[PDB]
C-alpha cells in the first residue's frame, strides 16, 4: 500500500477526491479555509498510485502528496485482475 | 594453432606449450584441500552474515561479555 | 446504512437485476479469484452504457447488479453512471466466504460531499515541505518515511537543527570511564531520583572542569 | 604430456556449470517458498518482528526508535517548556503545554507498516 | 586498587593512589594486568608489550602451550637424534640432525607428518 | 496477502543495500556487517589471485615464456568444452595438443619483473594466497564474535548512572573510528607497504634480473629515468627507490591524526573545523564517495603510466597487453569516478543534515546556496565544446569529402604543446646532467597534431556532460522547482506523475542511469583515441580531424579480421572474438526495449499471457498464478536492466575488436 498524506495547505477544491479512480480520498469538515473543509485518505489500501489526485491539485505545491512504495505493494495497490491475493 | 589478426602471422608470434604436466596431480589435491576449507568457512561466514548479530544472545549464552583493555581506551579516548 | 445480501456471483445464475450485456473475456478471472466487487444501482429507464471489462450493456428499468474483479471497474462504472444523473449506486466487496462489505458511498454521503463525523485522515498540519529530513530520522522509527512523522517529531528535530548549528556554545559528551564503571548489573545502588542529582553534579563537575581547563591558553 | 589435467577438467567444468547450477536454482526456488525468504528486505516477515524485538530487549537499544531519546530530565524539560509558554501565552488562552505536546505527538496514520500484522 | 581510577566520567577522573596500586611482581613498576587473573601462570602477572590488553588470553594460553609442548618434543628430538638414536628401520641414515630435515623430505617421509599435523592441526582450529 | 514476481527484482536491486535491511536497527549492526562484508571481498580477491597463479602454474607456458618473451604469447588458460568438434582439431590448438587461450591480462609480465622464475615458485604462491583467503575469512568470524562478545558483556555493564546509555554510540568505536584509522592505513598499509616492497625489490627482484652482484648494498637505489633498453621498461633499482622515497613520505606523514593516545597528534574533526570543510565526516556515504573519487585518480593515471613508462619486463612488446591493460583501467576508472558521484547523491539523500533555510556554514549549504549558477555554467560550457567541437568536425568532414583537404579548420594544439616543450626541456636537462645518458622515456611525451586537440576537446566534453548530469542529480536529490519534495522520497523512484507537466525520469538515481550513458560514451571516445593512436600514429596524426577517418579508417579498416574469424572459409582463433562481438551486439540492442518501450505495455501483455495460461487446460488445475503473480518489471527496474544490458553490450563489444586489430 502507498501513503498518501493531505497537507494544510488544502482549499477543499474537491478535485483530487473527483479524480481518484478507487475511492481514496474524502471531503472532512475542517477550519483552516474559506470552504470549511479539506481532503481526507481514509482507504489508502487502496490506492493505486495513479496520482491523478495530484495532477488535480491546484496549490502551489500539492496539499495531497502520494508517496509510492514499491516494496509494500499489495493486491490492491497493483491492480490484480487475473489473480487473487484472498 | 590457426593464427588470426596480421600481426601474428606478419611476425611469426608463436605460443610454445610445455611438452611437461606442469603441476601433478598431487600438487591439484594440495590446493584443493585449502579451496575446500576456504569453502567451508566461506559457506559458514555467508550464514553468519545473513543471520546477523543476536543482541538476545545475553540471556541465554554463557559467560559475562568481553571488552578488550585496548577497545575500552578506544572508547574513552574519543570518535 | 444498510448493507444489501449481495449474494456470490457463482451462485447467483441467471438474476433478474443482472442488465442485459453482450458479455466478453474481460470479465473476472473464475476458476483462480475468489474476491469480487458488486454494484448495484437503480435506473430510471434502460439507457446503455459500456461495461469497464469491454462490451456494452443495458441497465434495467428496475433494480441492476454487476459483478467485477477490481473496486477500480466498479468506480469507473460509477462515475459512468453518475454521469447520467444516476445516484444511489452502493459498491459492495465480497470476501471468499460471501462476506460483503460496504465500499464506495461508505457513509451513505458521496466522498466529494462534506459529511459530518469524517476526520481528516493521514493530516499534516504544515506544508509540504515542513515534513523532517530524512537524514535527522535515520534508525529512529520513520528510518526512510519521514513523511510519517508526527508533527511533534517534526518541531523536535527542527529544534534540533537550530540548535547544532551554533558550535561553540554547544556541550561536548563526556567520556564514559569504562575501566572504573560498568560492574555486574545486579551492583546497584538503586534509588532512581538519586540518581538525576547524581546527574547534576557530575555534570556540574564536567562543566567546571573544562571552564577551568580552557582559562588556560584562551 | 601437456594434457593429463583434462582428466580434473572433466569431472570440474560439467560438475560446477551444470551439476552446482541446477542445484544453486532449484534451492534458490525451494527457499523462494519459506516463510523466512528474503526477510531482510521483504516486508512483514516472522524473523524481521524477532530480530526487532530482540534488538527492544537490549538494555542499551531499549529507547533507541524513540526520535525524542536523550533527555536527561524530561521533567525539567517540560516544566522550562511550560514555564516559557505561560511567559508567552496569548491573552486568555485556554491551551496548556502538556495537552498540546500529547495532541502534537498524536497523529491519524492507519496506514502506516500495517505489515506489522501477517507473520 | 584494581581499578584504573575512580570517577564517572573520564574527564574528571581520580587516578588511584599510587602506594594502592596492585602492581605487577614480576615487572614492580607496572600495573597489574587484570585480563590475566584466574588463568594459571597470573601470579606473576608478567605481560609488558601489553600483548594481552588487546588479545583474548585464550588465544595467547592457546598459543603458549602450543609453543611450549612443541617446544618440549623438539628439544628431545634434536637432543636424541644428536646423540645418535635414528628410528630403527633404515633410510633413517641422517648422520646429522642439522641435514635430516632437508634428507627426509627428500626421502617422502615429511610430507606424510605434514599432513598429519595438518590435519591435527585443522582440527585443532575447529576447537581452538 | 503475498508478493508478486517483481519481488526478485525488488530484492535483488537493493541485496547490498545493507541501510535499507529490516533487521538492522544500529550503527553497530550497520558497521559490523560491512566490516564483515569488507573481509568476505578480501577473501574473494585473493582468492581470484590465486586463481591466476594457479592457472598459469598448472594450464600454462610460464616456464617457455619467460625463456623467449619478446615473440611467445602467454596461456590464459586450457579450453575444455564438449561443444567443440570432438573430430579435426580446433583452431586455438596444436593438432592433437590440448586446446589453449592466450592471456591478454599482462600477469606474466608482472610475475617476470617480480621475480618469477620458476612453476614451483608460482604454485607456492597459490598456496599462501589460498591460506590467506583462509585468514581473511576467519579474522571476519573473529571480528563478528568480539563485536558480539562485547554486546554481551553489556550484560555487566552499567554507569550505575543514567548516562550509561551514552555507550550506544561507542559500541562501533572500532570501526567508525576515523583517526586512528587514517594514521593506521597512510602510516602501514600505504608507506610501511611501498617499504617492504622495496625490500622484496632488493632481494629478489634486482638480484633475480641481473649477474650476481653485492649483498643488496644501496648501489642498488638509483636515479635513472625511463625505459632501461634490453627489457624497455623502467629499472627496477629505480622502482625500489621510488617506493623507498614514498614509504618514507607517507610513514613520516602517517604520524599525523590523534591514534592511540591523547596527547599525540590533531584530531580529524579540528582539522576540518578551521578550515573550508566540516563536513558530516560519520557518513559512510560520503567516506565511500570521496574514497571511489581518490581510487579514480589513482587507476586513471595507472591506465595512463602502464603503457606510458611500461614498468614491466617486455611488456611494451606485446601490442595486446598494452592497450588491453589501458582499456581495462579506463573503463575501471570511469565506473570509479560516476561512482563517486552517485554516493554524493545519496549522501545527500539520506545522510546529510542541513540547516533550517540561511544559515550558509557547511560546505553542501554554500554549494546548494547557488546550484544553479554551477549548473547553468556547466551546461554552457558542455554547449560550447560541443557545439565547436562538432563544427569543426563537421567542416573538416564537409571540405574532405568535396576533395579539398586544405580547406579544413585545423587549430595547432599549441599549449599541449608548450607544455610537452616545457617537460621535454626539463627532461633533456636532467639527461644532459648525466655521465650515463641517451636514455629514453617511451610515451611520455607524443606527438600532438591538431586531430590529437580535437580530441581532447571531445574528452573534455564527454567529461563536462558526465559531471553535469551528477552533479545535477545529486544537487537536485532533495529538491528541484519541479519536485520540491525529493528528499522525502526514496534515492530512486519511479516518477512523480504525468501531471505537472510530466515527470519520466526525475529522481537521482535517474540521473545517475543518464549520467552513465555519458560516462560509456566519453570512456568510449578514450580508449577509441589510444587505440587509434596505436595502432598508426602516421595516419592517425594525419588524417584524423574529419569524423570520417574515423568511421573508414579505423573502425570499417579495422575490423577486417575480427568478422572473417568464423566464416565459410574455415576459423582462426579469433572465433571466440567474433562470436563474442556479435553476442555483445546481440546484448546492447536487447536492452533498448527496456529503455525505450515502457511498462505499461509489457503489464498488458502479461495480463493477456497469464490469461492464456489459467485459460490452459492443465495449467489452470496446478496453478492459479495466486504464489509468485507475473508481473511486468517496474519502471526503476526496468530502467535500471536496459541500462545493464547496454553497459554490457557496450563494453564487451570493444575486447573483440582490440584482439582482432592488435593481434
Ligand atoms: C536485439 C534486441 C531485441 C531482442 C532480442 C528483442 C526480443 C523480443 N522482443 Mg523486442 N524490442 C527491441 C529489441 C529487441 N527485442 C527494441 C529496440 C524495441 C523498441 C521499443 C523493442 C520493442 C518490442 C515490442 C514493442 C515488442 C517486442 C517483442 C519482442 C519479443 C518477440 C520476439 C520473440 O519472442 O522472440 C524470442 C526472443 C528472442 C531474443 C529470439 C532469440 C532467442 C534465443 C536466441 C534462443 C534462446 C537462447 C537460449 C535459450 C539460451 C538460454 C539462456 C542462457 C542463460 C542459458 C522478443 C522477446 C514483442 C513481444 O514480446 O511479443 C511477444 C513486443 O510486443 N519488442
Ligand atoms: C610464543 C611464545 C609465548 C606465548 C604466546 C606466551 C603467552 C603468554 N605468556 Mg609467556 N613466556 C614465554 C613464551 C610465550 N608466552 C617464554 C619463552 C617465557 C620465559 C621467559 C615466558 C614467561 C612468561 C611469564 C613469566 C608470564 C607469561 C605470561 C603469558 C601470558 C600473558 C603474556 C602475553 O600477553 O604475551 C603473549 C604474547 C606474546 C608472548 C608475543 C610475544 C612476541 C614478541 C614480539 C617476541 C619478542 C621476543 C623476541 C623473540 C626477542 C627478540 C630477539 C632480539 C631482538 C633480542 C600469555 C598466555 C604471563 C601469564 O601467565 O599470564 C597469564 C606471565 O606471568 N609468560
Ligand atoms: C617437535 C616434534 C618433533 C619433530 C618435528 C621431529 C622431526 C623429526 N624427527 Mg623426531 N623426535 C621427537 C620430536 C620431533 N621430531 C621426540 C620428542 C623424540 C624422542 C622420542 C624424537 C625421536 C626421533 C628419532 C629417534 C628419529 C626422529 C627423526 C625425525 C625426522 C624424521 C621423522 C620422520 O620421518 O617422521 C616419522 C613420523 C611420522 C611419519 C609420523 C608420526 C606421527 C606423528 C608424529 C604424531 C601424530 C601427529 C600429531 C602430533 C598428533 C598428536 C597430537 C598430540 C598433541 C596429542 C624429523 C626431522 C628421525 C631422524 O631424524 O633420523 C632419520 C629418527 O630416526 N625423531
Ligand atoms: C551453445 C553455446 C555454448 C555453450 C553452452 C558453451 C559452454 C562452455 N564454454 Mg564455450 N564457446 C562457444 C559456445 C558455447 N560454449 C563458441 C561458439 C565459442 C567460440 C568458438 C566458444 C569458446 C569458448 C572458449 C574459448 C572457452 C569456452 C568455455 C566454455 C565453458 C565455460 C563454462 C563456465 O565456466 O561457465 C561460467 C559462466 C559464466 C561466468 C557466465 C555467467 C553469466 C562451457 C562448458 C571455456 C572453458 O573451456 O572452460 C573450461 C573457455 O575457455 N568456450
Ligand atoms: C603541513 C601541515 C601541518 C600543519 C599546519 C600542522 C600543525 C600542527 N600540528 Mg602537525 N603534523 C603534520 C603537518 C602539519 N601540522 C605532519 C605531516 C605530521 C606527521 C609527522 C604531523 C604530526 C603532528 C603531531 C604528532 C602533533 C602535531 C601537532 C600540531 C599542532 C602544534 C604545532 C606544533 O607544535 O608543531 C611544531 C599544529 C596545529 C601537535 C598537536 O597540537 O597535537 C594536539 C601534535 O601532537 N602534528
Ligand atoms: C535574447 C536571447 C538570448 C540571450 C541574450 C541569451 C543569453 C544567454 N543564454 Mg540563452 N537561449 C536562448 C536565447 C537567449 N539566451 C534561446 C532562445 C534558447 C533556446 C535554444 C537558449 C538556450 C540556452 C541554453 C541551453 C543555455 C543558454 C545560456 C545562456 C547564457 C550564456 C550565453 C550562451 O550560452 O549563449 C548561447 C546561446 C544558445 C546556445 C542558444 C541559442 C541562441 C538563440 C538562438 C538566440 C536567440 C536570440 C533572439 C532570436 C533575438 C531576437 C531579437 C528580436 C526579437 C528583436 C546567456 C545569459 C547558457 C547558460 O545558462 O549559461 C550561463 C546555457 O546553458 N541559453
Ligand atoms: C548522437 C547522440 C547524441 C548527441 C549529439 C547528443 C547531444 C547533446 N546531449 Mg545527449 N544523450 C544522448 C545522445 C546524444 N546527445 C544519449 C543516448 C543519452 C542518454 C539518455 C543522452 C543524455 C544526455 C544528458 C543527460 C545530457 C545530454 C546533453 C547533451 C548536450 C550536450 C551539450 C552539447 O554538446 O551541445 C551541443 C549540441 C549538439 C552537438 C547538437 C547539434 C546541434 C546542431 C546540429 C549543430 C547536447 C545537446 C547534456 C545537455 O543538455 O547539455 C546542456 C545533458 O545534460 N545528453
Ligand atoms: C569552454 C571552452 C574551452 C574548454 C573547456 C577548452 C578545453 C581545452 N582546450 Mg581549448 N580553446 C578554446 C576553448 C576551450 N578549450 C578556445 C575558444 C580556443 C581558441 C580557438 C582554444 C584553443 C586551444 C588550443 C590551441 C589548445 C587548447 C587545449 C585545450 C585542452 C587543454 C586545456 C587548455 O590548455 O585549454 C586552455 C584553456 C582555455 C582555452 C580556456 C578558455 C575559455 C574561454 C572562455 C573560451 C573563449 C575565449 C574567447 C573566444 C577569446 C576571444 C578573444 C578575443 C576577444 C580576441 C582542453 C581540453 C590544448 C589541447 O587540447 O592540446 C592537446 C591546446 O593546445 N585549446
Ligand atoms: C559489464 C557489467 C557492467 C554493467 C553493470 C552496470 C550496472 C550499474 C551498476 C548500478 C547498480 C546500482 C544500482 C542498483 O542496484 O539499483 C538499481 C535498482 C534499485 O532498485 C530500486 O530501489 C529503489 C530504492 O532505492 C526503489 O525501491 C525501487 O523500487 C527499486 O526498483 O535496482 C533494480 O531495480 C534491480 C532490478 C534488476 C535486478 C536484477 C538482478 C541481477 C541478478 C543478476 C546478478
Ligand atoms: C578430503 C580430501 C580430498 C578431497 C578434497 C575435496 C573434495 C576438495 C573439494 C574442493 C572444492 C569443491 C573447493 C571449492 C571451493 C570454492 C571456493 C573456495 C569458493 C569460495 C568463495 C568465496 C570465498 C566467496 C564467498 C562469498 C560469496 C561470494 C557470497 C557472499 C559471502 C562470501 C564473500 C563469503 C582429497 C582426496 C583430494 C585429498 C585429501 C583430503
Ligand atoms: S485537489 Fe488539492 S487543494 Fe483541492 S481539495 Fe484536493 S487536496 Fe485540497
Ligand atoms: S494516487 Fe490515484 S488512487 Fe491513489 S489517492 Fe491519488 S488519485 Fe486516488
Redesign the pocket.
Same mark, same amino acid.
Given at each position: 500500500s502507498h501513503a498518501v498524506k493531505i497537507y494544510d495547505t488544502c482549499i477543499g477544491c474537491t478535485l483530487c477526491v473527483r479524480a481518484c479512480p478507487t475511492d481514496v480520498l474524502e471531503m472532512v469538515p475542517a477550519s483552516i479555509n474559506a470552504a470549511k473543509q479539506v481532503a481526507s485518505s481514509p482507504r489508502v489500501e487502496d490506492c493505486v498510485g495513479c496520482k491523478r489526485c495530484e495532477t488535480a491539485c491546484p496549490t502551489d505545491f500539492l496539499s495531497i502528496r502520494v508517496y509510492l512504495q514499491d516494496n509494500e505493494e499489495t493486491q490492491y495497490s497493483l491492480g490484480l485482475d487475473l489473480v487473487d491475493w484472498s | 594453432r590457426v593464427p588470426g589478426g596480421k600481426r601474428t602471422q606478419e611476425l611469426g608470434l608463436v605460443i610454445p606449450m610445455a611438452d611437461e604436466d606442469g603441476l601433478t596431480d598431487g600438487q591439484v589435491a594440495g590446493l584443493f584441500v585449502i579451496a575446500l576449507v576456504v569453502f567451508i568457512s566461506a559457506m559458514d561466514l555467508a550464514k553468519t552474515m545473513y543471520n546477523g548479530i543476536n543482541p538476545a544472545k545475553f540471556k541465554t549464552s554463557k559467560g559475562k561479555g568481553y571488552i578488550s583493555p585496548l577497545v575500552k581506551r578506544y572508547i574513552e579516548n574519543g570518535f | 446504512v444498510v448493507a444489501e445480501a449481495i449474494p456470490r456471483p457463482e451462485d447467483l445464475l441467471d438474476s433478474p437485476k443482472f442488465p442485459m450485456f453482450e458479455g466478453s473475456t474481460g470479465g473476472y478471472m473464475s476458476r483462480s479469484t475468489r474476491e469480487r466487487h458488486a454494484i448495484t444501482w437503480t435506473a430510471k429507464g434502460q439507457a446503455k452504457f459500456e461495461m469497464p471489462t469491454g462490451g456494452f450493456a443495458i441497465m434495467n428499468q428496475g433494480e441492476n447488479l454487476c459483478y467485477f474483479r477490481k473496486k477500480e471497474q466498479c468506480i469507473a462504472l460509477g462515475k459512468q453512471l453518475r454521469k447520467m444523473k444516476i445516484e444511489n449506486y452502493k459498491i459492495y466487496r465480497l470476501k471468499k466466504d460471501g462476506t460483503v462489505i460496504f465500499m464506495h458511498p461508505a457513509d451513505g454521503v458521496f466522498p466529494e460531499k462534506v459529511n459530518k463525523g469524517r476526520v481528516q485522515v493521514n493530516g499534516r498540519p504544515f506544508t509540504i515541505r515542513g515534513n523532517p529530513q530524512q537524514s535527522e530520522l535515520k534508525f529512529t522509527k520513520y528510518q526512510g518515511k519521514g513523511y510519517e512523522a508526527d508533527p511533534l517529531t517534526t518541531m523536535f528535530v527542527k529544534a534540533r537543527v537550530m540548535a547544532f548549528a551554533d558550535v561553540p556554545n554547544l556541550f561536548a559528551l563526556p567520556q564514559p570511564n569504562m575501566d572504573e564503571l560498568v560492574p555486574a548489573e545486579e551492583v546497584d545502588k538503586y534509588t532512581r531520583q538519586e540518581y538525576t542529582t547524581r546527574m547534576m553534579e557530575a555534570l556540574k563537575r564536567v562543566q567546571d572542569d573544562r571552564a577551568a581547563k580552557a582559562a588556560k591558553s584562551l | 604430456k601437456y594434457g593429463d589435467q583434462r582428466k580434473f577438467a572433466a569431472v570440474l567444468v560439467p560438475l560446477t556449470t551444470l551439476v552446482f547450477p541446477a542445484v544453486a536454482m532449484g534451492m534458490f526456488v525451494l527457499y523462494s517458498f519459506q516463510e523466512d525468504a528474503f526477510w531482510r528486505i521483504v516486508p512483514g516477515t516472522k524473523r524481521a518482528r524477532e530480530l526487532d524485538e530482540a534488538w527492544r530487549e537490549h538494555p542499551l537499544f531499549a529507547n533507541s526508535k524513540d526520535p525524542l531519546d536523550g533527555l536527561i530530565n524530561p521533567d525539567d524539560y517540560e516544566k522550562g517548556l511550560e514555564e516559557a509558554w505561560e511567559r508567552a501565552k496569548p491573552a486568555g488562552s485556554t491551551v496548556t503545554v502538556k495537552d498540546k505536546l500529547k495532541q502534537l505527538s498524536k497523529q491519524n496514520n492507519p496506514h502506516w507498516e500495517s505489515w506489522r500484522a501477517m507473520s | 586498587x584494581x581499578x584504573x581510577x575512580x570517577x564517572x566520567x573520564x574527564x574528571x577522573x581520580x587516578x588511584x593512589x599510587x602506594x594502592x596500586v596492585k602492581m605487577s611482581p614480576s615487572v614492580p613498576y607496572l600495573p597489574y594486568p587484570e585480563r590475566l587473573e584466574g588463568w594459571v601462570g597470573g601470579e606473576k602477572g608478567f605481560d609488558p608489550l601489553r600483548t594481552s590488553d588487546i588479545i583474548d588470553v585464550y588465544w595467547l594460553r592457546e598459543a603458549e602451550l602450543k609453543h611450549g609442548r612443541i617446544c618440549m618434543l623438539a628439544t628431545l628430538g634434536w637432543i636424541s637424534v644428536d646423540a645418535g638414536w635414528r628410528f630403527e628401520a633404515e633410510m633413517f641414515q641422517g648422520v646429522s640432525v642439522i641435514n635430516a630435515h632437508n634428507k627426509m623430505v627428500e626421502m617422502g617421509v615429511m610430507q606424510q607428518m605434514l599432513s598429519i599435523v595438518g590435519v591435527c592441526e585443522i582440527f585443532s582450529l575447529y576447537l581452538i | 496477502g503475498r508478493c508478486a514476481s517483481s519481488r526478485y527484482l525488488q530484492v535483488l536491486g537493493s541485496i547490498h543495500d545493507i541501510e535499507c535491511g529490516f533487521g538492522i536497527d544500529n550503527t553497530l549492526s550497520l558497521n559490523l556487517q560491512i566490516f564483515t562484508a569488507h573481509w568476505g571481498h578480501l577473501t574473494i580477491i585473493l582468492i581470484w589471485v590465486s586463481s591466476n597463479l594457479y592457472h598459469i602454474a598448472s594450464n600454462a607456458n610460464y616456464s617457455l615464456w619467460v625463456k623467449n618473451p619478446i615473440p611467445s604469447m602467454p596461456i590464459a588458460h586450457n579450453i575444455w568444452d564438449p561443444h567443440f568438434t570432438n573430430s579435426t582439431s580446433t583452431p586455438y590448438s596444436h593438432t592433437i595438443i590440448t586446446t589453449i587461450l592466450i592471456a591478454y591480462s599482462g600477469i606474466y609480465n608482472q610475475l617476470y619483473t617480480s621475480g618469477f622464475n620458476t612453476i614451483n615458485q608460482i604454485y607456492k604462491t597459490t598456496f599462501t594466497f589460498s591460506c590467506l583467503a583462509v585468514i581473511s575469512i576467519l579474522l571476519a568470524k573473529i571480528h563478528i564474535n568480539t563485536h558480539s562478545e562485547l554486546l554481551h558483556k553489556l550484560a555487566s555493564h552499567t554507569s550505575q548512572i543514567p548516562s550509561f546509555f551514552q555507550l550506544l554510540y561507542f559500541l562501533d568505536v572500532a570501526i567508525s573510528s576515523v583517526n586512528i584509522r587514517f594514521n593506521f592505513h597512510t602510516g602501514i598499509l600505504v608507506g610501511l607497504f611501498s617499504i617492504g616492497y622495496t625490500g622484496h625489490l632488493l632481494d629478489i627482484t634486482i638480484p633475480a634480473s641481473r649477474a650476481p652482484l653485492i649483498h643488496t648494498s644501496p648501489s642498488y637505489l638509483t636515479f635513472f629515468g625511463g625505459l632501461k633498453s634490453n627489457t624497455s621498461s623502467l629499472y627496477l633499482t629505480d622502482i625500489a627507490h621510488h617506493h623507498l622515497a614514498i614509504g618514507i613520505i607517507s610513514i613520516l606523514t602517517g604520524h599525523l591524526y590523534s591514534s592511540f593516545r591523547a596527547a599525540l597528534g590533531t584530531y580529524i574533526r579540528d582539522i576540518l573545523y578551521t578550515s573550508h570543510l566540516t563536513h558530516s565526516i560519520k557518513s559512510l556515504h560520503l567516506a565511500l564517495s570521496l574514497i571511489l573519487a581518490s581510487c579514480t585518480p589513482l587507476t586513471s593515471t595507472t591506465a595512463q603510466h602502464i603503457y606510458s613508462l611500461t614498468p614491466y619486463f617486455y611488456l611494451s612488446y606485446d601490442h595486446i597487453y598494452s592497450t588491453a591493460l589501458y582499456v581495462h583501467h579506463s573503463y575501471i576508472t570511469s565506473f570509479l569516478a560516476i561512482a563517486s558521484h552517485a554516493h554524493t547523491a545519496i549522501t545527500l539523500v539520506r545522510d546529510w543534515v542541513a540547516p533550517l533555510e540561511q544559515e550558509s556554514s557547511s560546505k553542501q549549504i554554500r554549494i546548494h546556496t547557488h546550484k544553479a549558477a554551477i549548473i547553468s555554467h556547466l551546461?554552457w560550457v558542455? *554547449?560550447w &565544446?560541443?557545439?565547436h567541437? *562538432? /563544427?569543426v568536425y563537421?567542416h573538416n568532414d564537409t571540405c574532405i569529402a568535396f576533395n579539398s583537404p586544405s580547406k579544413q579548420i585545423l587549430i595547432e594544439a599549441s599549449n599541449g604543446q608548450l607544455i610537452q616543450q616545457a617537460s621535454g626541456k626539463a627532461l633533456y636537462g636532467t639527461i644532459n646532467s648525466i655521465n650515463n645518458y641517451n636514455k629514453s622515456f617511451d610515451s611520455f611525451i607524443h606527438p600532438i597534431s591538431p586531430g590529437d586537440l580535437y580530441v581532447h576537446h571531445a574528452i573534455a &566534453?564527454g567529461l563536462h +556532460?558526465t559531471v &553535469? +548530469?551528477l552533479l545535477?542529480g545529486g544537487l537536485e536529490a532533495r529538491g528541484s522547482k519541479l519536485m520540491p519534495d525529493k528528499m522525502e522520497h526514496s534515492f530512486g523512484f519511479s516518477c512523480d506523475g504525468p501531471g505537472r507537466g510530466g515527470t519520466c525520469d526525475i529522481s537521482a538515481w535517474d540521473?545517475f542511469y &543518464? /549520467?552513465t550513458?555519458?560516462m560509456l560514451?566519453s570512456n568510449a571516445w578514450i580508449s577509441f583515441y589510444f587505440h587509434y593512436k596505436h595502432l598508426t600514429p602516421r595516419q592517425f596524426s594525419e588524417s584524423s580531424t574529419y569524423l570520417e577517418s574515423w568511421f573508414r579508417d579505423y573502425l570499417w579498416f579495422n575490423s577486417t579480421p575480427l568478422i572473417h574469424g568464423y566464416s565459410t572459409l574455415g576459423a582462426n582463433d579469433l572465433s571466440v572474438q567474433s562470436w563474442s562481438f556479435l553476442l555483445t551486439h546481440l546484448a546492447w540492442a536487447s536492452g533498448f526495449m527496456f529503455l525505450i518501450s515502457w511498462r505499461g505495455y509489457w503489464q498488458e501483455l502479461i495480463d493477456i499471457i497469464l490469461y492464456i495460461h489459467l485459460k490452459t487446460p492443465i495449467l489452470i488445475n496446478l496453478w492459479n498464478g495466486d504464489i509468485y503473480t507475473p508481473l511486468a518489471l517496474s519502471i526503476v527496474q526496468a530502467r535500471f536492466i536496459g541500462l545493464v544490458h547496454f553497459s554490457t553490450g557496450l563494453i564487451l563489444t570493444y575486447p573483440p575488436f582490440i584482439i582482432g586489430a592488435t593481434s
Open positions: - | - | - | - | - | 551546461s558542455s *554547449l &565544446l560541443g557545439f567541437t *562538432l /563544427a563537421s &566534453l +556532460i &553535469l +548530469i545535477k540521473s &543518464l /549520467a550513458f555519458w560514451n
